[PDB]
């Protein structure tokens, strides 16, 4: 089982940026395969035997490589070229594939929209608070977000999920849950979400208080 | 050309269990075919292959006496024995054809997801989310659907039936203690709503379960 090693593991790259990604093996490969993956489709065959581009993949595509080092290079980069790559060896068994890189594309910085929303009546009625918050729509994904209650910072039962690069936008967003008993919630006054992005030395704050 | 899998879905680890893969478009009768694994949130990972005959199936070495590779050319069907699971077998299971006999996997169906574990089946609360009790001087207004507590995954969030599209974010499950929680944000302008219905839609196969939450504004 000759084992492949792919680099970077993770890249953004400006529309137009040339863009290689290098596959290595444990072991000499007489062949290189190359697969691109989109969030929710299965694998997609990109490259045959080394340098050979698969049926509809556009011509700034390219391979090459030999013995333990191969590579795939975009000349060009764009938007629909942003996903997952991975390699393939079928020169010996077990046929085994790279760990895969992940490529995203450049856009203009964006200042996050952030939105707080208290519990819900009806989860309260359960003996349960969810207070939730939505970073909405900024670039680059790098982003803080704190909790604090009445005003002071707060660490336990924070609960965060990036969502991918839109394909609208190219822009991220992520959401921030902080979960209390609501016994625990009924006791304090002010709630706060607070975001520092690089697009502000200012941090963007929500907050609300109860009744 | 295409490939369907099937027999997936929740099992216990220790457990066994029997994929199938469908193909039709093509002669399967004449190609090597071949499954595919990748765990959530990982890389793809090399099952096996197996011939036109039977007569040559290649495996990982680890697994290659859990898992059972075999076809039915009468049938068009391939299948994987899966025999003590456990919780690295946890995966989405992709079927393939390995194009001619040389070289390359270039037809691949979506795959059958796979979740070993004890944990047992359970459906999602749903809450909706208004914004803060207020009326903002804002042009448009985020709503928030919370969907906590589920296992195992998929769930399915659609806004007003999958008719409001633009302006939603669905992010990603995140697990906790045995179960799921995820979130979904749409924005809309402030005319739209509260003056008209938005609803969350959110429908769990796993339990059967499918429940609408509409986000009507606070109140006292």
């Known amino acids: 089982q000759i084992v492949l090693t792919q680099s970077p593991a993770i890249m953004s790259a400006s529309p137009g940026e040339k863009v290689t990604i290098t596959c290595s093996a444990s072991?000499?490969?007489?062949?290189m395969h190359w697969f691109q993956q989109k969030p929710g489709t299965s694998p997609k065959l990109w490259i045959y035997?080394?340098?050979n581009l698969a049926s509809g993949v556009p011509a700034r595509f390219s391979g090459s490589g030999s013995g333990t080092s191969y590579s795939l290079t975009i000349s060009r980069m764009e938007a629909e070229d942003a996903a997952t790559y991975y390699c393939?060896?079928?020169?010996?068994?077990?046929?085994?594939f790279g760990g895969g890189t992940k490529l995203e594309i450049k856009r203009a910085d964006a200042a996050p929209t952030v939105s707080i929303f208290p519990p819900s009546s009806e989860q309260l009625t359960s003996g349960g608070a969810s207070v939730v918050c939505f970073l909405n729509n900024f670039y680059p994904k790098d982003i803080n977000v704190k909790w604090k209650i009445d005003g002071s910072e707060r660490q336990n039962g924070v609960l965060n999920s990036w969502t991918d690069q839109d394909s609208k936008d190219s822009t991220y967003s992520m959401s921030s849950t902080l979960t209390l008993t609501k016994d625990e919630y009924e006791r304090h006054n002010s709630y706060t979400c607070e975001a520092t992005h690089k697009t502000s030395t200012s941090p963007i704050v929500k907050s609300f208080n109860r009744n | 050309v295409k490939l369907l899998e099937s027999g997936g879905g929740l099992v216990q680890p220790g457990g066994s269990l029997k994929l199938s893969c469908a193909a039709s478009?093509?002669?399967?009768?004449?190609?090597?075919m071949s499954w595919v694994r990748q765990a959530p949130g990982k890389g793809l990972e090399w099952i096996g292959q197996?011939?036109?005959?039977?007569?040559?199936?290649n495996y990982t070495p680890s697994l290659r006496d859990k898992f059972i590779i075999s076809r039915d050319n009468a049938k068009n069907t391939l299948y994987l024995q899966m025999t003590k699971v456990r919780s690295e077998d946890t995966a989405l299971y992709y079927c393939?054809?390995?194009?001619?006999?040389?070289?390359?996997?270039?037809?691949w169906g979506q795959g059958a997801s796979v979740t070993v574990s004890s944990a047992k089946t359970t459906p999602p609360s749903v809450y909706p989310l208004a914004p803060g009790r207020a009326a903002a001087a804002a042009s448009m207004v985020t709503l928030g659907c919370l969907v906590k507590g589920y296992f195992p995954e998929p769930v399915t969030v659609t806004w007003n039936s999958g008719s409001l599209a633009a302006g939603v974010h669905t992010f990603p499950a995140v697990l906790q203690a045995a179960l799921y929680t995820l979130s979904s944000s749409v924005t809309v302008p402030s005319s739209s709503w509260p003056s008209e219905t938005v609803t969350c839609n959110v429908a769990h196969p796993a339990s059967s379960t499918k429940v609408d939450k509409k986000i009507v504004p606070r109140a006292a």
């Open positions: 393939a054809r390995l194009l001619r006999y040389f070289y390359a996997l270039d037809y």
């Open positions: 478009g093509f002669d399967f009768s004449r190609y090597w």
């Open positions: 197996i011939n036109p005959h039977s007569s040559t199936i």
């Open positions: 072991s000499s490969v007489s062949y």
């Open positions: 035997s080394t340098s």
């Open positions: 393939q060896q079928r020169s010996s068994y077990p046929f085994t």
